[PDB]
């Protein structure tokens, strides 16, 4: 009824009574704690009487009062005090509450504990830890373990996340779920990296685990030993396809920097040169070209219609590129022959650019390209203009990026021999191009002079390639140098591209560059601030760092200079890469703003985030921007759309028609600029790059920096025009081709129905062509033919039907490679 007696019994002696007070009280606390809430002071003291045993009664009683008072760390403490009065299986909402309440406490504690150290210890009140684990036990007895995991995820207890569930059940679906999750989640990668190792280990237990899992996991760890352990274990398990597919997991994932370790390792580790031959990936280049050469869907007529459309100096430049796109790796001079007077209408830089646009066209010809450049190469004389001559230099590496180091260094010798002007720029361009991601001090160094040689022409490229060389965590000294040279060296561009290099060699460093970031942020000059975002990108690109974004926002918010903001907005979609999701909602603010640059920078990042993705929703936001009075804006918007829109077209996306026609419209329009038509023709050519049969991909799964580069390269173009050919990087095959062991290329159309978008594409069956990352995965193989994959089906670019009876029927098939390669 009312607690007054129990209130009175409280102070009354005979701990017997006090017990039976507390006892009777305890039961009727639930209501009457309210009256009792004033007795708590004694009750406190009561809990301080070791004389009176049961006081844990009062403690939990107080805990009852405290929930009923909304006091918890109080209640918890005294519930913790209880241990007896308290139990987990005791079911009240309160108990459930206080537990759940008690629980949360653990997490940050554990996390704060996790902060300094991480693992076992007595720092945390074991009672909680117990009850924690006891619920984790209950979680184990719940036996849905993400339940336990997500806790232990935050609980950071691998002990819990040991392997109990592992041996239990759920062979394929107890790690990846969390693992793929962990990638998305855990702040400290170390905790996640801890998972990754064990995960591999859990998988290394191997009732034949999925390796691409481990691959990505390894690629996430970039731990060669694991792969080598795999490789041994592989060699232990050795099967061509297994090795192959592993090497196909490998050739498509491991960084140019990482993988090369494994190469020399795999070399030293012995074997199977096929692996070393898969390390080429030239097969892809071949297959890609093979795919291209085969599956190229061209219609230069419309591009001719675009080329014959208008004639000028700036515009004539653009169409020198879109032609490259449609020929990218496709190796054709079609229009190049059409207008030879084209070259007349080209200008020293366009002449320079027209010469470079060749490497695009031949990209993936790892022999011819040099011979392709040969007539325009160096020493081999020239018809006129050392830029055209300069053009090959940069044009060369386009094909040979990472693979032309020799010629590069060779050309770098030509550079070293004389760094200055085009002869040093175009070379100064293509050097870091192939040298990108490879750490060569000379590349840094040789440029560093060519840099310091202070040719706005030349020194610029140095500000890039040097970044490209040390692209990675690089070295802070060059940073100092660059940053020094930034403030030191007197030029707009030469000073400018530095921060870009700074942006480069700060890559994934994240927290690291924050200094220089802050420095760049604190810069008077836009340039440092400018690259800061890009720096922040390459640091935090992919995974969103809110604070970064938050900073990037507020920076873009807080900067006078618009380009910076524009940039700052642009670079967002990098640290915002992994979620294109809100990016429209994100830019939906910046979509609508007084300023064009803001509205300009909008286009890219979103156009970037969904480049390899969907969201006509995202798209349609930009179409108003495609009408923003500044052609430069829409030009960007034009581009931004097409960056997304490749392969997505034709009533899959009906809008492409306009968008295409819009270009043509513009391309027809005389009153639209060579801003306007520029992007238009390009964005057209974008959609039509790689015979329109190729895609744009980046961290769609693990990042590839080369995908990024062309973007950030293309970033400043109306700034510095002869760049965008960098964009050739993210060009990605939709190829679907049998491949196999002997590589007899058996081509089958595996025939599993997608709503058919190999029918949805530009005008002018499962084998190669359109496909789609999706239209890939609505299609599955037949078991009927000779060859079967272990991974059963897969994406488009990776192909490789695994080979399961030689010099017999199943005939023969060949391609560009089989000829020369």
């Amino acid at each position: 009824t009312s607690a007054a007696g129990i209130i009175s019994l409280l102070d009354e002696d005979e701990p017997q009574l006090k017990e039976f007070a507390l006892h009777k009280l305890n039961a009727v606390v639930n209501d009457f704690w309210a009256e009792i809430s004033e007795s708590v002071d004694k009750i406190e003291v009561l809990y301080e009487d070791e004389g009176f045993r049961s006081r844990q009664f009062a403690a939990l009683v107080a805990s009852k009062v405290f929930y009923h008072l909304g006091a918890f760390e109080e209640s918890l403490n005294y519930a913790l005090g209880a241990g007896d009065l308290f139990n987990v299986n005791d079911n009240s909402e309160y108990v459930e509450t206080i537990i759940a309440k008690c629980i949360d406490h653990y997490t940050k504690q554990c996390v704060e504990n996790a902060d300094l150290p991480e693992g076992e210890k007595k720092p945390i009140d074991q009672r909680l830890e117990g009850i924690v684990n006891k619920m984790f036990q209950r979680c184990l007895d719940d036996h849905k373990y993400k339940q336990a995991i997500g806790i232990a995820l935050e609980t950071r207890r691998l002990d819990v996340f040991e392997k109990t569930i592992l041996e239990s059940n759920d062979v394929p679906g107890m790690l990846a779920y969390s693992l793929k999750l962990c990638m998305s989640l855990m702040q400290n990668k170390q905790f996640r990296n801890k998972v990754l190792r064990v995960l591999v280990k859990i998988y290394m237990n191997l009732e034949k685990p999925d390796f691409i899992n481990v691959c990505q996991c390894l690629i996430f760890l970039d731990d060669p030993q694991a792969v080598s352990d795999i490789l041994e274990k592989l060699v232990k398990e050795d099967n061509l396809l297994m090795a192959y597919q592993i090497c196909f997991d490998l050739y498509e994932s491991a960084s140019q920097q990482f993988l090369s370790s494994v190469i020399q390792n795999l070399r030293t580790v012995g074997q199977t040169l096929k692996m070393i031959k898969i390390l080429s990936g030239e097969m892809a280049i071949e297959l890609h070209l093979q795919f291209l050469i085969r599956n190229n869907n061209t219609d230069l007529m419309i591009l001719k219609n675009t080329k014959d459309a208008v004639r000028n100096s700036v515009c004539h430049t653009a169409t020198v590129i879109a032609n490259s796109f449609m020929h990218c790796g496709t190796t054709s001079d079609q229009f190049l022959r059409d207008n030879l007077e084209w070259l007349a209408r080209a200008t020293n830089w366009a002449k320079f650019t027209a010469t470079a646009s060749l490497g695009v066209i031949h990209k993936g010809h790892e022999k011819e390209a040099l011979q392709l450049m040969a007539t325009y190469l160096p020493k081999d004389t020239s018809p006129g203009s050392a830029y055209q001559e300069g053009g090959g230099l940069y044009a060369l590496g386009l094909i040979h990026a990472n693979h032309g180091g020799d010629i590069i260094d060779y050309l770098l010798n030509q550079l070293k021999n004389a760094s200055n002007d085009i002869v040093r720029h175009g070379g100064s361009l293509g050097l870091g191009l192939a040298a990108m991601g490879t750490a060569r001090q000379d590349v840094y160094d040789l440029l560093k002079t060519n840099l310091y040689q202070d040719d706005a022409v030349t020194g610029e490229a140095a500000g890039l390639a040097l970044g490209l060389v040390m692209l990675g965590s690089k070295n802070a000294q060059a940073i100092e140098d660059m940053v020094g040279y930034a403030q030191e060296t007197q030029h707009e561009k030469i000073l400018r591209g530095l921060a870009v290099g700074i942006a480069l060699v700060m890559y994934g460093r994240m927290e690291e560059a924050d200094a220089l970031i802050e420095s760049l942020c604190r810069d008077k000059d836009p340039i440092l601030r400018r690259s800061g975002m890009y720096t922040v990108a390459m640091a935090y690109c992919g995974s969103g760092n809110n604070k970064a974004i938050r900073r990037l926002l507020h920076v873009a918010v807080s900067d006078v200079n618009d380009d910076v903001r524009r940039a700052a907005v642009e670079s967002l979609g990098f640290i915002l890469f992994r979620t294109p999701e809100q990016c429209p909602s994100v830019v939906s603010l910046l979509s609508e703003s007084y300023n064009p640059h803001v509205r300009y920078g909008a286009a890219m990042a979103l156009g970037i985030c969904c480049a390899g993705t969907g969201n006509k929703e995202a798209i349609n936001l930009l179409e108003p921007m495609t009408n923003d009075p500044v052609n430069y804006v829409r030009q960007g918007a034009l581009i931004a759309s097409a960056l997304i829109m490749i392969q997505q077209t034709e009533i899959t996306c009906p809008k492409v028609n306009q968008f295409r026609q819009l270009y043509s419209k513009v391309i027809n329009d005389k009153h639209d600029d060579v801003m306007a038509k520029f992007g238009a023709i390009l964005a057209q050519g974008i959609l039509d790059a790689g015979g329109h049969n190729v895609t744009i991909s980046l961290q769609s799964g693990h990042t590839h920096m080369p995908s990024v580069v062309g973007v950030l390269v293309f970033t400043q173009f109306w700034f510095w025009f002869p760049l965008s050919h960098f964009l050739s990087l993210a060009y990605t095959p939709t190829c679907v081709i049998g491949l196999n062991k002997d590589l007899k290329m058996p081509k089958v159309q595996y025939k599993s129905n997608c709503k058919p978008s190999t029918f949805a594409y530009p005008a002018p069956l499962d084998n190669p062509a359109r496909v789609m990352p999706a239209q890939l995965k609505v299609l599955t193989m037949p078991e009927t033919c000779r060859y079967q994959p272990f991974k059963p089906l897969s994406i488009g670019g990776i192909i490789i039907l695994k080979d399961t009876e030689l010099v017999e029927p199943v005939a023969a098939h060949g391609p560009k490679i089989e000829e020369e390669e």
Partner: protein
Amino acid sequence: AAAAEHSQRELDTVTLEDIKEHVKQLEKAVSGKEPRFVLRALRMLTSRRLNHYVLYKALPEVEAYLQLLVVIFMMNSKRYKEAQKISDDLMQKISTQNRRALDLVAAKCYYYHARVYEFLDKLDVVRSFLHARLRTATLRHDADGQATLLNLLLRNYLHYSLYDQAEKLVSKSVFPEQANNNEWARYLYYTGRIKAIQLEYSEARRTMTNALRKAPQHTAVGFKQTVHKLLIVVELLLGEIPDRLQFRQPSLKRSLMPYFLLTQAVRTGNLAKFNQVLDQFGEKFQADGTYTLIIRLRHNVIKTGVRMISLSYSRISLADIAQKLQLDSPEDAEFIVAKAIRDGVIEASINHEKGYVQSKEMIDIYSTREPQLAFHQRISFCLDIHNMSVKAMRFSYNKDLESAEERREREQQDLEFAKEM
């Protein structure tokens, strides 16, 4: 016939805030009921159980709602037998109802449950439940049901005599947002009240004033009539006479007569008249608890007596004051007046040997401190009224985009033409 609305109300069974709207008309959906029309729900539907229940008396998201219709049916039918029993069976089912939307619906439920109730088993056994899920819902974060339930148990404490239990109850309470202004004023009402009985007046006037603001009007009379009764009481105890325009507003002027016979007693400062009036209307004042508040005034009345005797006389022989206030002895007086002085009422001194009060001046004419505070306080009010209106007013907002592309093109063309010229 009218049951169509009950079906139309069921068309509000889609999702979320529909229920809100669903309830509104459902407030007046109880105009027409027949026992045979009860069989409508029997045909509307678990189903078998429902049917059985219907029989005794005489989809789930609307199951609770139709149970509401059962309660409403019974309670409004006077019949307590079936109505009471049903509540126990209906209240339980709907209560344990493992649904979130249902909590909102049950509030109307609880609102009736307590209502018909009479004693212990209802004050005590039924109260333990309201506190139980009060905690449950509190963790379930349903604002409306919480506030309602809280109000019900408060009303229980005051049907009881326990102000303290309810006070310390408030001490551990946090009230939520999203409310119904009526429930909001029910709260502010009970709050102000208990806050008053404990002697603290100056914060009671506040909560009751809000109980006037936040209350709706239409015909919600008796609540206004009653509160005002408490309003007049507080205003009176605090020492601030209310203006006549109070004892004559509406039909309530027929119930405020007692208080209108108190102020006439109080302002005059004549004790005997007061007392006589208290005897006169006492019984009338007992039907609510304003009584024991009113009986406190004996202090205030005399304070008034003294203050008037002071303003109207510079110095008075104690004899005379004792005559005007009817009191027995002078010795009584100088205790009373000595008290009045300490309280900053008279500003006098007393000449004892000649026994006459002699009185302080208004040197305090333009204090300046007084008017300032009053002025300051007012300004904050205007500001807030201007801030809240700027944050609320600030909410068909869309359809934005000046400039254009078609026209822009036209403009460009014009420009080109001009250039050509």
